[PDB]
Amino acid sequence: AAQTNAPWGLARISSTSPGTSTYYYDESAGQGSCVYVIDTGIEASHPEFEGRAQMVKTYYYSSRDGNGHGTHCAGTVGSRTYGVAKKTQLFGVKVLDDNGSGQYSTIIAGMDFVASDKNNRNCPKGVVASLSLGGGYSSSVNSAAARLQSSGVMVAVAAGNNNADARNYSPASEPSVCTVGASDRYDRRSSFSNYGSVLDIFGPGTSILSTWIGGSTRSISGTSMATPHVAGLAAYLMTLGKTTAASACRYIADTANKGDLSNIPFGTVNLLAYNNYQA
Ligand SMILES: [Ca+2]
């Protein structure tokens, strides 16, 4: 399949070179997989989601996304126009309030929720979770991410937007999950992207067009934007039978575009997510 005039990030993940605008992907498109978006919620009624999105949990007085950030992330995972895995099922878990804030205890509960809740969903090709959030180092937050992964969910988490070493951030610093840094349209590390040995992969994170609340669309930037590219990619690869939740991060790193990013600090992986699709 070919989607012309795609957001640059989708084009990038299906390309061996920057500077193209068509996204190429196998038509299976993540069908039969599920991706949890643990964030501010998802505006499931957005036409871009086509009835494939659902809120399954909130820790606040509403499950609606009153922020937009969760909707944007979900859009990058699986919206018709702006998504990597255009046929995946999206499940929203609102651990962040409408200001994008959440207490670590709520974030942890949301992770353990997903580890159980996948048993209540139909996801024959596998389960993924996208965590576009973070704060300072917490062993408890890291452990929750590790549990979610261990339970059979491909966990992708943002590296963080501090232009600092991700070792000091959670869940970014958890070795057993997939920690995702951000790049720009010209294959430069995003100016704000964290780095360090704990990163596993980079994805497109600067100026990413996706869905927003009020049935709209929006370009924003962050490792929060790179993460769902990787999460959607995992779902897509799992539907293809190429990998599984336990090894998807490794497989993505193994099959990535290598050594093509600039401004990667010494010691950080130079790996950009790539679907290796031969149209
Ligand atoms: Ca790892």
Swiss-Prot record:
The active site is at D39, H69, S224. Keywords: Calcium, Disulfide bond, Hydrolase, Metal-binding, Protease, Serine protease, Signal, Zymogen. GO terms for biological process: proteolysis. Residues 7-279 form the Peptidase S8 domain. GO terms for cellular component: extracellular region. Ca(2+) 1 binds at P175, V177, D200. One of its GO terms (molecular function) is metal ion binding. Its cofactor is Ca(2+). The keyword Metal-binding applies. Ca(2+) 2 binds at T16, D260. It catalyses: Hydrolysis of keratin, and of other proteins with subtilisin-like specificity. Hydrolyzes peptide amides. Binds 2 calcium ions per subunit. It is an enzyme of class 3 (hydrolase). Disulfide bonds join C34-C123, C178-C249. Its EC number is 3.4.21.64. The keyword Membrane does not apply. Hydrolyzes keratin at aromatic and hydrophobic residues. Belongs to the peptidase S8 family. This is Proteinase K. It comes from Parengyodontium album. The chain holds residues 106 to 384 of 384 of the full protein.
